Amino acid sequence: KKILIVESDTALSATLRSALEGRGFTVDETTDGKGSVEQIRRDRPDLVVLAVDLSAGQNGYLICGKLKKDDDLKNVPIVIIGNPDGFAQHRKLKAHADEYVAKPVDADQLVERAGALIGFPE
């Protein structure tokens, strides 16, 4: 089970990657929001952990929007990590994510949600 973390906070990304790896997921990381949709197309992760507050002012909800509108990528499960002050708005939309986890992230909660969406590695 393969996860891509799209997060420019490298310290957070490394922490979350380690928790997920300890549970048995294979995990990759990218700091590059501009590039992430095409990376997901080439690599096809089983799940994406997607930060809202990406580099250079990028809105990670917009990446989710591109993914939920792409016929080949719209079923990749998406866990948003971000300020919960944005979740109520985003949950209404056609391009809502599959799970929303507040920053500051509880790594164990994130691991649980990943397993809930794609199953735990066995």
Residue numbers in the entry: 3 to 124
Which lines from the publication concern this structure?
To explore the potential for intramolecular signalling, we determined the crystal structure of the FrzS RD in two crystal forms, a hexagonal form (P63) at 1.0 Å resolution and a tetragonal form (I4) at 1.9 Å. The hexagonal form was solved by molecular replacement using the first RD from the diguanylate cyclase PleD as the search model. The R/R-free values for all data to 1.0 Å resolution were 9.2/12.3%, below the average for structures at comparable resolution in the PDB. In the FrzS RD, the conserved Tyr102 adopted an ‘inward-facing’ rotamer. Remarkably, this conformation was distinct from those in either the inactive or active CheY. Furthermore, the conformation of Tyr102 is stabilized by hydrogen bonding of the hydroxyl group to His92 Nδ1, clearly visible in difference electron density in the high-resolution structure. In contrast to the CheY structure, we observed no conformational heterogeneity along the α4-β5-α5 face of the 1.0 Å FrzS RD structure, even at low contours of electron density below 0.25 σ. In the high-resolution hexagonal structure, a discrete minor population was modelled at 34% occupancy for the side-chain and backbone atoms of residues 55–62. This alternate conformation suggests a coordinated mode of motion, but this segment has not been implicated in dynamic rearrangements associated with RD signalling. The position of Tyr102 in FrzS is partially buried, suggesting that apo-FrzS does not prevent interactions along the α4-β5-α5 face by steric clashes with the switch tyrosine.
